Every structure is written in structure tokens, then in C-alpha cells.
Amino acid sequence: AAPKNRRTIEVNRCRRRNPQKLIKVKNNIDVCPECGHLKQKHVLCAYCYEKVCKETAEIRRQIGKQEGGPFKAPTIETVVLYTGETPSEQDQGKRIIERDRKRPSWFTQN
Amino acid sequence: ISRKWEKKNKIVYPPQLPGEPRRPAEIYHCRRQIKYSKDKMWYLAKLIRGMSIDQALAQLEFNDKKGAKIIKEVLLEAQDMAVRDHNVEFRSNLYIAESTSGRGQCLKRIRYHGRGRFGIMEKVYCHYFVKLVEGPPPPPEPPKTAVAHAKEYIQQLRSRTIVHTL
Amino acid sequence: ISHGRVFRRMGLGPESRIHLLRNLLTGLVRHERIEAPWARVDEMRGYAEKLIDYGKLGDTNERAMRMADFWLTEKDLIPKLFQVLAPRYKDQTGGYTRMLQIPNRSLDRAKMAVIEYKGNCLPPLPLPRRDSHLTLLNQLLQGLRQDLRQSQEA
Amino acid sequence: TARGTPSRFLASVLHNGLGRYVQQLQRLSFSVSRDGASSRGAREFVEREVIDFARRNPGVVIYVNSRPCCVPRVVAEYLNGAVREESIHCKSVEEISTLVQKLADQSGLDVIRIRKPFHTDNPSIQGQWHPFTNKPTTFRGLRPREVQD
Amino acid sequence: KSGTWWDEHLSEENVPFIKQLVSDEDKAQLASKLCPLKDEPWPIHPWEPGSFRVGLIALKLGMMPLWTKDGQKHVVTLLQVQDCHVLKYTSKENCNGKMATLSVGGKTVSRFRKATSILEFYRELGLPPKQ
Amino acid sequence: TEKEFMQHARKAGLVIPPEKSDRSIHLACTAGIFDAYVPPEGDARISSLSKEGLIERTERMKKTMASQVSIRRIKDYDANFKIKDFPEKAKDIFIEAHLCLNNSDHDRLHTLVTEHCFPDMTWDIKYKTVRWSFVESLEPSHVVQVRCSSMMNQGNVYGQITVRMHTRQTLAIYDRFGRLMYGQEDVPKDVLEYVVFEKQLTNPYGSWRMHTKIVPPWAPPKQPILKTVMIPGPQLKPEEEYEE
Amino acid sequence: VKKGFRAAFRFQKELERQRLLRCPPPPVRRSEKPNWDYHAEIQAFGHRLQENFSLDLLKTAFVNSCYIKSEEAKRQQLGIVLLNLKSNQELSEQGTSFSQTCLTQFLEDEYPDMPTEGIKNLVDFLTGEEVVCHVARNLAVEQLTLSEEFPVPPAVLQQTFFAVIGALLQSSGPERTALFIRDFLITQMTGKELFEMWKIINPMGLLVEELKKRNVSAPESRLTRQSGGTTALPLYFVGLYCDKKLIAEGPGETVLVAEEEAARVALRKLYGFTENRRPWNYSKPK
Amino acid sequence: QLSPTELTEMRNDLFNKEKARQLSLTPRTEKIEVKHVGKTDPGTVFVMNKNISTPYSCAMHLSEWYCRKSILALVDGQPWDMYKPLTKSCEIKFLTFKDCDPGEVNKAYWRSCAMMMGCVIERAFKDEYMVNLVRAPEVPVISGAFCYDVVLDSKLDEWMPTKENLRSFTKDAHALIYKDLPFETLEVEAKVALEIFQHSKYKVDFIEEKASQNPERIVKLHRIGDFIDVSEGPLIPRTSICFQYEVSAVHNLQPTQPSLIRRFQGVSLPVHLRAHFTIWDKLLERSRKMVTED
Numbered sequence A: 001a002a003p004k005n006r007r008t009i010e011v012n013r014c015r016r017r018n019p020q021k022l023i024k025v026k027n028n029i030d031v032c033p034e035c036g037h038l039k040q041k042h043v044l045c046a047y048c049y050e051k052v053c054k055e056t057a058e059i060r061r062q063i064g065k066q067e068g069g070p071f072k073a074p075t076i077e078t079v080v081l082y083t084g085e086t087p088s089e090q091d092q093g094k095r096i097i098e099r100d101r102k103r104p105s106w107f108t109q110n
Numbered sequence B: 001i002s003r004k005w006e007k008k009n010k011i012v013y014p015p016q017l018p019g020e021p022r023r024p025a026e027i028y029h030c031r032r033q034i035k036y037s038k039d040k041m042w043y044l045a046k047l048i049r050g051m052s053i054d055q056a057l058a059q060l061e062f063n064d065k066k067g068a069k070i071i072k073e074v075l076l077e078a079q080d081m082a083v084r085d086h087n088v089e090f091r092s093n094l095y096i097a098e099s100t101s102g103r104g105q106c107l108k109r110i111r112y113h114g115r116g117r118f119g120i121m122e123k124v125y126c127h128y129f130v131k132l133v134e135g136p137p138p139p140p141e142p143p144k145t146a147v148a149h150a151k152e153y154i155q156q157l158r159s160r161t162i163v164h165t166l
Numbered sequence C: 001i002s003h004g005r006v007f008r009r010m011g012l013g014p015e016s017r018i019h020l021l022r023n024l025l026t027g028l029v030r031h032e033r034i035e036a037p038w039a040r041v042d043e044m045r046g047y048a049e050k051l052i053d054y055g056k057l058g059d060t061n062e063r064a065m066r067m068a069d070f071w072l073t074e075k076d077l078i079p080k081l082f083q084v085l086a087p088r089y090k091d092q093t094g095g096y097t098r099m100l101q102i103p104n105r106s107l108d109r110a111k112m113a114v115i116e117y118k119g120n121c122l123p124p125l126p127l128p129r130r131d132s133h134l135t136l137l138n139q140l141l142q143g144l145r146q147d148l149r150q151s152q153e154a
Numbered sequence D: 001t002a003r004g005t006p007s008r009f010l011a012s013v014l015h016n017g018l019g020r021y022v023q024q025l026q027r028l029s030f031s032v033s034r035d036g037a038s039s040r041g042a043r044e045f046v047e048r049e050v051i052d053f054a055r056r057n058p059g060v061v062i063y064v065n066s067r068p069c070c071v072p073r074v075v076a077e078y079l080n081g082a083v084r085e086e087s088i089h090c091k092s093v094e095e096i097s098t099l100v101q102k103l104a105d106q107s108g109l110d111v112i113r114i115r116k117p118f119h120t121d122n123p124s125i126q127g128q129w130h131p132f133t134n135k136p137t138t139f140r141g142l143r144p145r146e147v148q149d
Numbered sequence E: 001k002s003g004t005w006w007d008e009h010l011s012e013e014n015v016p017f018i019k020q021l022v023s024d025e026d027k028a029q030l031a032s033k034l035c036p037l038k039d040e041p042w043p044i045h046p047w048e049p050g051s052f053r054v055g056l057i058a059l060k061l062g063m064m065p066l067w068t069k070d071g072q073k074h075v076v077t078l079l080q081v082q083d084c085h086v087l088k089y090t091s092k093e094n095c096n097g098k099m100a101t102l103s104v105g106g107k108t109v110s111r112f113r114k115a116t117s118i119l120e121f122y123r124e125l126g127l128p129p130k131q
Numbered sequence F: 001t002e003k004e005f006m007q008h009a010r011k012a013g014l015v016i017p018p019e020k021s022d023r024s025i026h027l028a029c030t031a032g033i034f035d036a037y038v039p040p041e042g043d044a045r046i047s048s049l050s051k052e053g054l055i056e057r058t059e060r061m062k063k064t065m066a067s068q069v070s071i072r073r074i075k076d077y078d079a080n081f082k083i084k085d086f087p088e089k090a091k092d093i094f095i096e097a098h099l100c101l102n103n104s105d106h107d108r109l110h111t112l113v114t115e116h117c118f119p120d121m122t123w124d125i126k127y128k129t130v131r132w133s134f135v136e137s138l139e140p141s142h143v144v145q146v147r148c149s150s151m152m153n154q155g156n157v158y159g160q161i162t163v164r165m166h167t168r169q170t171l172a173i174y175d176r177f178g179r180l181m182y183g184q185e186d187v188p189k190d191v192l193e194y195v196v197f198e199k200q201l202t203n204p205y206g207s208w209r210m211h212t213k214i215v216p217p218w219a220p221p222k223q224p225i226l227k228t229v230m231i232p233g234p235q236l237k238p239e240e241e242y243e244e
Numbered sequence G: 001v002k003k004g005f006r007a008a009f010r011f012q013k014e015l016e017r018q019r020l021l022r023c024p025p026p027p028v029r030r031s032e033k034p035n036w037d038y039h040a041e042i043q044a045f046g047h048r049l050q051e052n053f054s055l056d057l058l059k060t061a062f063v064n065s066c067y068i069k070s071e072e073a074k075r076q077q078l079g080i081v082l083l084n085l086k087s088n089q090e091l092s093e094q095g096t097s098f099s100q101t102c103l104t105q106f107l108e109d110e111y112p113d114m115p116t117e118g119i120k121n122l123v124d125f126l127t128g129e130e131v132v133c134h135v136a137r138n139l140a141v142e143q144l145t146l147s148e149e150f151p152v153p154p155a156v157l158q159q160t161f162f163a164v165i166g167a168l169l170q171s172s173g174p175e176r177t178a179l180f181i182r183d184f185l186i187t188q189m190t191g192k193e194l195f196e197m198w199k200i201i202n203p204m205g206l207l208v209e210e211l212k213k214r215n216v217s218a219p220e221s222r223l224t225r226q227s228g229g230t231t232a233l234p235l236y237f238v239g240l241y242c243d244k245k246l247i248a249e250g251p252g253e254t255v256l257v258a259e260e261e262a263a264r265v266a267l268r269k270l271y272g273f274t275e276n277r278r279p280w281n282y283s284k285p286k
Numbered sequence H: 001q002l003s004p005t006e007l008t009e010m011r012n013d014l015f016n017k018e019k020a021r022q023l024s025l026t027p028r029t030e031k032i033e034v035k036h037v038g039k040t041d042p043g044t045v046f047v048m049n050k051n052i053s054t055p056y057s058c059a060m061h062l063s064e065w066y067c068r069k070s071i072l073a074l075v076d077g078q079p080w081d082m083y084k085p086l087t088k089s090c091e092i093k094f095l096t097f098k099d100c101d102p103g104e105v106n107k108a109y110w111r112s113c114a115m116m117m118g119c120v121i122e123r124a125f126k127d128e129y130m131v132n133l134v135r136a137p138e139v140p141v142i143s144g145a146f147c148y149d150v151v152l153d154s155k156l157d158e159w160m161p162t163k164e165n166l167r168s169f170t171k172d173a174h175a176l177i178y179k180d181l182p183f184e185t186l187e188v189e190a191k192v193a194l195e196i197f198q199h200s201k202y203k204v205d206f207i208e209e210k211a212s213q214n215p216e217r218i219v220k221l222h223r224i225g226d227f228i229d230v231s232e233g234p235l236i237p238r239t240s241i242c243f244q245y246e247v248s249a250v251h252n253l254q255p256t257q258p259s260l261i262r263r264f265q266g267v268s269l270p271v272h273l274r275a276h277f278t279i280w281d282k283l284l285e286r287s288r289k290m291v292t293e294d
């Protein structure tokens, strides 16, 4: 089926600029208490999620240098250690992961 | 081609008299040859039209359209330009005055169809124009109420004359 | 009409759906935290909770070993399930994993989410925290609670 | 168109002619060329006609600026401020003489559609009609089927 | 300019209390209507031919077989009536109709998920909101 | 359908013209001062003590052998030149050069200032209105230091004369929209600045033009601006942690 | 590129017209525009109005005090003989005083029942800033006026207009100048009501005072006609009854408005400024 | 004696003269290097103007988000009003309702609602009755309501407000909220402060108390539009901050025979901490109960 007549711009504006087609304003945007960057109420902060992944990748790179190959997953717990720290009383019989960097403030030692 | 929007920033006004009111700062900025449809760009430009500079950025930051990232980059460099070059005291004071998209120079390619047929595909480009005015955004026009409707209707009944006579 | 359907339609079929979740489940055990589309994370979350339930049955249980054998493509993670994850949740009876939403990826603006096993050694996620008890709204409700309890005592 | 053009009501300038008639034409500017066939008719108008025309219209100042031009023109300025420019390019003496005379009689208002061929500031003398003009009054002004006391 | 819900700003210690507070209130309000003939009831007229009385608002539980003494098998639907109360009365004059309308509500719902106009309507009636 | 954009221009270098070329760029002014001049600390106090200032200026020129012979080089190319007329001539050049900024007379400003001084004057006022005036003069200008360039550095010889000026000036700067931005158009304030001039002695058509201004380390802070400013801290990526 | 000059020339003129509409130039005095001769434009001024003006007196009628002060400052900038020009202050005072007395004479004879305050307002209206300027701008008065700022301010324009009367008063006498006021200032109240020029407050309070002077009892307001009382578009006709005799009837949307209008109708009949009054006699005096 | 309609006219004139005098004492332009210390945007330095720039002006430099959520400013460990001009270069830190320890913010908001309630008391009663404000007791937030001591005319010795009268105060308070009037704070010497409130002896005693505590004897003056009152500590920036506002009930303090002092109580919540209608009714009931400071 082919158009019988050309649709005019006046008809087109009513369809293209209809409120349904228009982008809806979002009212769920709030500032992150930690860094001040913008975030949504039901979504984790992009800036705060990126810093965790940057630190996680470095930790996972240290794991690779200790395992030294695939199919070598340890059967014990893992502990991440930074400069200026010693294994805890509960951190006995676990795999200590050394990081040559100061412990991040948001990363609480447990 | 036309590049008047760039020249709209180079106009210098005469010094104001001491009794004259403060003139709001106007900043004209644009980005040319954006690889985006102007029709799709219009929805993003219509969204932030009339908003504050910080409110516009928040809407564009969580918008999934590709032009949202492009427009946000234009607003950041326009906000920086206003303080650096246009003598604007507060960067957040700015609000969106004019925000529209325009057609850009487009390429033409051949899109192959079946039965040895073909169509002419164009690589669409668009321009984005933004104008910033210093000062709080104007309050939105309140919806017309019954008293406003009643006052106008009675005025129409009072302005009618006896037509086709003396 | 889809009333009562709990399982989603993913992959290239019912079998490919299992393999997609099996890869996510296997990748979840090895790393204890992965990022994936929200729908696939939510569909895999049920299998992650029940995998620990089979892990608590012990490696001496033949049925529990077969579930671990199938749902863990890499065979080095099977000892980890029965010796690390299962002992960790010994006191717990549920809620082994937490699912949180993350900003949509720039590739296709897909709804993304992160699923992790609780108690991992990875840096903590910026978990959503409710307003502190010292806020103005909480203080008014705290004062109301005290009076109601005090009047209840007398 | 009438719909595609503006319109106005019939009127005059400062109620002209009510107590006295004031010629609304104020100034005429003729720009003729010493050399050029287009102004041959305009030159003949200046040689014999513009002199006698100034006698009949003492309130109108006439300027005859002789400068090279291709299209001779006459500029008419009126008291109300309207400026009307007309071209006498290649017009005979009679055509210019009649054209200039028409400019003298006009009031200067825009030559557009006039809504009414009449205009009065006092349309009625016995009272403009109102719905109660021909309605009789009732005893105590009672409304239809209204009971009092 | 942003919407909010009832437990957005509540802390970890207030959420259990707020839920318990309103839960106790709903129990008390429903238990305060257990004496309708003692709290000044409306006059009880006897039955008349051509009379129409009010109905109930029941909740469909399911189905269950039921046999008769003649051997026939019938399937019935279990309609459970819970939190069914009279809401308001509108006279015939204000009804704009031949009959008189009586409002009835069924099944308690959370007060945190209702409109302000509806909440204040049930506040003066002393009943929890009905679905 | 094979048409494409004409995007083919590539970046290049502007520092040096093409090599192996007989033509070379002709320079009318030197980049900087041959020998830096450091005015004695506390010279602002000497401005009030006019009697002591007159003695010091004359003695310093005589006690400086190097600056005394540089004057001889200047008169070798221009016999009709006196050091007792130059400070009075410098005032007219200085005032006239700053009067062209209000009217944007850049055509004549090049004859009053050097090519090095021009960017410092006009670039920051490109889209701004300047209302500058010379109200009154307190102390006559004195030729502090005269030093010339080395003989035939590049085929040309340059000479620089340092002149000290202490006069009241009025400055009013308006932004692109005409709003007041800096200074007061009514109240003048004293300005104590050391103006350095230059002239290409080898060039027969050369003339003395303003070259730069000496800003002493002990100079008082300038007049604060009307508006407020913000200085943002370093932008921090998620992996980076702030240090205080 | 098509050869031809006439089409290209014609298109440039059209473009110039568009340029004027987009960016209109500031207005300028007619004197600065070409084809202007101050001596010739002022001689035709008298003949246009059919008056025997004096050139020496009329040339001093358009000269303003502000113009002289600015003109002298121009010579100081060039350091440049002295000017003996006289301003219009002397002539304006003569014209203004005569015009008010001549208008008072005309209005008091036409309307003997109009109070002195009512006559004062009408003279203050016909000689007002708006009426005088409207008449002045359509008689080529602003074009001949020598002002310091263009366009001529309404205050400056009003003062120059009376100087023309002052120049006419001396040259032609009072009888001839009396027709000049009647033909240009009286004709400005033709299509205008009494209270549209003499704006008043509380006409009912003014009506009560007028009937006391005539020893007439206070009127009683009663509803003569009524329509749509319960609607948002009512019509009330309230009538004023003195000794059970109707003196005026006024319409209005509400009762208070109708009664106020009825008072205005009563005042018009008492003062003789009704619409039915006979028109001003502009015929030549016998 | 001056009429109530003209009594506020002279108070603003003294307030305006004193406010304009402080501007005159400030030089033409003085720069203060305000340094931002916070978890958000570290290292930011604001080059502001002395006695002209306010912490709100510093917020406008960073973002509009600060301008909406920064209820109070913490300067050098001391609370600072948002519209209070800065006196010297110093570290600055903003505070919001939703913080880990919003103790200072709640007190500033709680005192602000007491001041707002006082404004509508001077307007609700008839001009024939003599209503003189006493003070705003600094009750804790956990008490459940904010109160303002008010003494009425001798004629209203036994008159008790009804349900309709209390709703009238709420409409007057909401009319004050819709106007979005800013809180203007002015620190003045006690000698100047006593001049404004000479008529009200109930305020002279309160002012003299503040002069004893402060060695410099400077008294803070806060005004909402035309209404001027004496308060302690910083307040919220604007009246639009509070969203839900309602006066609970009025109770008479004791002893009554020597003097009758009434306690106007109410509860309020800002936009940032909006509560639900069901929860809001619970706060109304508690606030109706009389509360006494410790």
C-alpha cells in the first residue's frame, strides 16, 4: 500500500511534537552524598561504581600472578592486604593478597 | 555555508548608563557537522529548552540517546566560555534560552536492493545551536484559569458592535 | 497470554537459556562479583541461591555433587563451593547474594546490574543507605516512639 | 483582495473641513533630468505648468531638483506624515498635470479599502436601540408569573 | 519537584516501628465496629414486598466440589467476605435515581498507597481504606 | 554515490618558513630587554621626596659607565638628539598610545608601540570597551637607564631607553554587554610605572616606540575586580584519591 | 551568470527595502533630510492655515530655550557673531493665557449650565498635553519647531504650539485668532462624551449636590428594567426619581454600576452636554 | 502611642539604616580567599568579596544543587547563615537535612519555624487586642513540636483557640510559605538592638540576656519581609524550605495569676524530608501534647 497523498508538515508537526513523542523529564536524579556526582535513586553512583571496579581489577590482577594459570582456584578464603598492614587474628590460613598502595578510605578492613 | 552563530558572540554593546538596568549575558555557541539526525536531535534540544544550566546537564546525563552526550559536551564548553570570556559571575546562573538543531552537509551513498535495484542512502549530519542567558530561568506560564477565561469572554462580548450599519 | 510464567525466554531456546545462566553462575562463583544485563542477573539469581543449598548438603552427597558438576563448567570451582561458599553461609538460611543496579552500558544502553556473593573479599559496593536516625523526620518519629512506649509501661 | 490587504474606516485629518478646509498636501519634490528623454514631459511641465500650479496652491512648497536620473519622480509629503512617491517617467504634460492635481486633493491617508462609505461620531439622536425600547412596563414591574406578598 | 514514598527518609530503626504502629491502628479501628447495634444504630424496619437490601464484597478464594443427597456433583466457588463495611449513605433525593445508593467497601489496603482525598475520607469514618 | 567530504587539510608548523630560502623574516623589535633593570626597593617613597629623587637620577647615570657610552652610540646615527627632551617626548607617546585603545585605532597604535607590546595591549580588550584618560601629572619623567644592543647582531642595532613615569590615571573597562567590569570612571588614582622604549637605530625610518613595562617585585597589589571568581580544585578520576 | 544590469539593479533596490524593515534607521528631523528650506516652509505655513502671519514673529515662535542653549555649546567646542535669537517663552505665555480665556468664553456661552469646574476641565483637556500635540503634529508644527532633541518632547511641542497663537494674536488681533482656536481646538471634542474628558469620581455624590443648589429633593433609585439577574450576564436599568418623576435611566451589568451610570446620565442632562445637544455652529459669524 | 500598622514601619527604617551602615563601613572592594573543605569538589577556592558575598553566592559558583540542599553553612566549625555576608577568608562547608549528624541543621530549622509562627501571631488577632511576643523556647527536636511563648490581651484571659482558629494560623503560615521570603540575618550591637524594640519590654530582657553571654554584646536580628524578631543562632535561608506546616494546639503556662503566658505549639517538615499523610497525622497528635524544656 502506497500513500495516496503527501502528508503536510502541519500534520507532521502534530505527530512528531506530540507529548508522547517528547522526552519525559526525570525527577529521580539526586546528588551522591560521597562524591557529589549525579545519580538516580535506584541506581548506584556511576563515579562510585567505577572506583570499585578500578580497585577490583587491580586486586584480580594480583590473584592471577599468584595462581599462575587457570584451573587453580584456591579452596580457602581470600584476604586483600595493603601497605602497612599485617594479617589479622581471623586472617589465618587464608590467601593474603598484597597491594602496594594505601588502603582506600571507603574500603573498610574486615 | 552560513556561520552567523559564531559572529553573534562578537557583537559588543555600548557601555550602559548608571541608571540603566543590568543587561543579561548572552552566549552563542554551536557544534557543526554532528553525525546525527537533526530530527532525533530536536527531541534532545526541545527537552533542555528553557531549563537551567545544571538542570539541563542532569537530564542529559541519564538520557540514553547518543546526542545527549554530544549536547552535554557543548553545554560544558559553553558554560566554561561564559565565565572565561563573557564575564559571567556564576556559572550555574545560566539557563537555556535558545536550543535548536539544524541540517548539516550530508553525504550520499548507494544502498543496494534486490532485483538489481538500489536506493540512495544519505549519511545525515546535523548542527546543534545553544544560547545561554545569565539569570534565573523565567517561571513557566501559569495555565489559563476560569477567571482568565471568563474575563476574556466578557471582553469579547463588550467589543462587539452593530455591523453593516452606521 | 502469559499468566504465572516465572521463567524468561532467553538465548536460542530452553537449552541455550540454561547454558547462558550456567556461564553466568560459573563466572559468579570464580569472581564472587560480576556485571551482566539486569534480566539475566535476575533470572540467574534464583539458581545462585539454590546452588549454595546444594553446597550445604556436603560433597559426600551424590545428588549435590551432580548439581555442582553440571552447574559449574570449570571443575576447579567445585571444591570451592563445598569448602568456601558453603561454610561461609552456614549460619545463614537465605539471602546469599545481593543484586544492585548499575548505570546502563554505553554499548547498547542495556539495563545492567551487578550480582555478588555476600562476604567476599572484594571492595564493598556503594550500597544504598537509608537516612540516618539523627535526621529531622526520624527524630520526630523517635520522640513519638518514646512517648508511646512510656505510656504503654504506665 | 480585501482579505489579503489591510483596511481602515473613513476619516479625515484633524476634522478637516469642519470649520475650515486645510489643504493636506504639504510638499512636492520633482527630480527632473537636464538630459534624458524620460524627463521630456517633466521638463515641459516645469517650463510652463509648475509656475502656475504654485499660484493655485500657496500652502504647498515645491522643490524642483535638476539632477541626472533615469526615472523622473515626484515626491508628495502630507501633513499627517505619509510620504507618497510617484514616477512621471515618460508622461506627457497633460498626464503629469492631472497626476499632480490628484495629489493635491488627497488627504494623505493610506489608499486602501475603506470599510464603510460613511462615518459619523453621533450615529443616533433618539437613542440607540436596546431590547427594552419597545417593551411596555408592567404594574410594579413584576416578572412573568411572579407573586408578590 | 520530586516524588516520594512513605519509607524513603525512614531509618533502619523507624521502618519496623512505623509498620507496627499503623498495623496496630488498623486492628483497633476494625475492632471498634464490632458493636453496630450498640453504637446508636439506624432504625431497623421489617421486611416489605418489593424491598432491596445491600450486598457484600467478597474475595474469590477458589473452587471446591460439593455433592448433594441425590448423587449429583456440583462445583462451587468459595467467596470469603473480609473487612466488608458500610462506607456512606446517599439518600434517594441526592441519588438522582429511583433507588437509594449505599456505599460498601471490601478488603483492607495500605494507607501509604492511597490518595490524600481517600485517606481523609476514611479518617473521619474511622475505618481502614478498602481496595 | 561516491562523493565524499573535502576533509584533507593537515596540521603543519608555523615556527619557521621554508628552508633554503634567501628571504628571511624582517624583525622591527627585539623580543625582550637586553639587560634587565631592577629599580631600587622603596622607590615609591622617593616619589614623595622629589628633592632626593632629582639627585639620584643624575648621579646614577654618571656612575654607570656602561649606560653612559650607550648614549654615544645613539648619537652616532642621530646627531640631533638630546636626553633632556626625550622624557617630555615620551609622555606624548605614552598618552597617545593609550588614547588609541578607546577608539580602537590599531592603525596608528603600531607607530607608537612595538610589535611585542601590541598583543599585551589589544588582545585582552578585543571585545571590551576601555575608557582611559590622563588627568594630571605629579612628577616629571626621568631617563633612568639607557642601554643599546650589541653591534650588528643580525645586521641591525637596537637601543632602549628606560623612563620612569608617576602620574594619575583614570581607567574604566566595560565588558561586551557594556556592564562595568573594572575600575571607576570618576576617581583617578596614582600610577607608578617604568616604561621601556625601543628604536631600531640601523633602520633610517625607525622611531622610538613603547616596548614594555617594568613591574617591580615590590609593587603594590592592583585594584581588585568588582565580580567574584572561583578556582576549582583538581578533577579526580574514580581511581585517583585526593591528597590535602 | 546571466548578462543584464536592469534585473540586478532592480533586485538591489528590493534588498534595500528589506534591510530597512529588518533594521530600521533612527528617525531624523525633516530639516536634515534633502529638499528643505526653512524660509520657504514657514511662508507656506501661514498660507496653508489661511492666516496673515508675520515672518519675524513666527520665526521666533518655533525657537525653544533648549535649542538656544545647545547651539551656544556647539560654538564653544569650536571656539567660535553673537546670536540675538529670541525664544518662544514670551509668545507662549501670551498664547496660553489668551487660549484659556477664549476657550472659557466659548464653553461658558455654549453651556451656561456647566459648572466652572466642568468648564475648567474641558479647557484643561483641549489645551492638554495630548490634544495639543495631536493637533500640532498634523499641522507641520513639529517640522518647523527648532528643538534640541528629536522627536520633540510633548511638553516642548505644546509650548511651541501656543507661540504660534501668540504670533497670530499680535498680527491678526483677537477676533481673527478666535476662529483659529475654534477651528482646531473646539473640533477636538466632537465624538467625545462629557465625562470622557472631565473624569470624575462618584457621580452620585456630585448629583446630590447639584439638586440641592436647584432646591430639588434627592432622587430615589429604583429598578426600571431587569434581565438575567441570576446569570453572569445581567442587565439592570436603574432610574432616578425626583418627586416620583424620572430624570434619567442608566444601564449596567450590576445594580451599583447601573446606578452610577444613571447618575452620569442625570448629570449630562442637567449640564446640557447630552448627545442630543445641537452641534457647534462653525458657520462664519454674521 | 504608635499604632501596630506603623510600629513595623520604624523598625525596618532602623534595620535598613543599620544594614546600609555596615555596607558603608566595608571598603569599595575587598577580596577574601574562601577555601572549600568537603567531600565534594575538594580543593576549590572561592575569591569572594568581604561583607558582600554570602555562602549562597559561593554555592552558585559550584552548582545549582548546592543552592537547593545547602540548608546551613559551616564556617570554621561554626554554623553560618546562607545569606549572611562573609567577613574574612576562611574554610567553608555546607550542610543538608540528610547528613550523618544533622544536629545543627535541625536546630536551625526548628528555630526558624518558631520565628515563622511568631509572624502570623501578630497578624491573626484584632488590632484592638495587645499581643506581645515573649520568646521562642529552644526545645529539642525530639520533643515533637516547636513552641513560642505569647502573652495576649487581658480580655482573652479564658479564651481558648478552637479547631477552626488553629486552621486559620496554618493558612496564614502557608501564605508565608508561598511568598518564599528569605531570612535576612543582621548582627548588631545591643545598644542599637535595644532601640528597635523599646516598646516591647518582653524583648528587652531577652536582648539583655544575649548581651551578657556575648563579650562583644552583638545581637542577631532576623526579619521575614517586614516582620522583625530576635533569635539565637543561624536559621534556614527561605520560608519555602518548609513544606508541611501546621499548628497543633495552644496551652497556657503556669502560674497564671501574676501573668498569663500562652504556648503556641506546632510541627513542621521541610520539602527535603517530606512525610506521608498517614505518618503526618501521627506527628500532629504528639505535637498537640504540651512540651516543656528541660
Ligand SMILES: [Mg+2]
Residues within 6 Å of the ligand: B116
Ligand atoms: Mg546482483
Ligand SMILES: [Mg+2]
Residues within 6 Å of the ligand: C002, C003, C004, C005
Ligand atoms: Mg508475565
Ligand SMILES: [Zn+2]
Residues within 6 Å of the ligand: A032, A033, A034, A035, A036, A037, A045, A046, A047, A048
Ligand atoms: Zn558517588
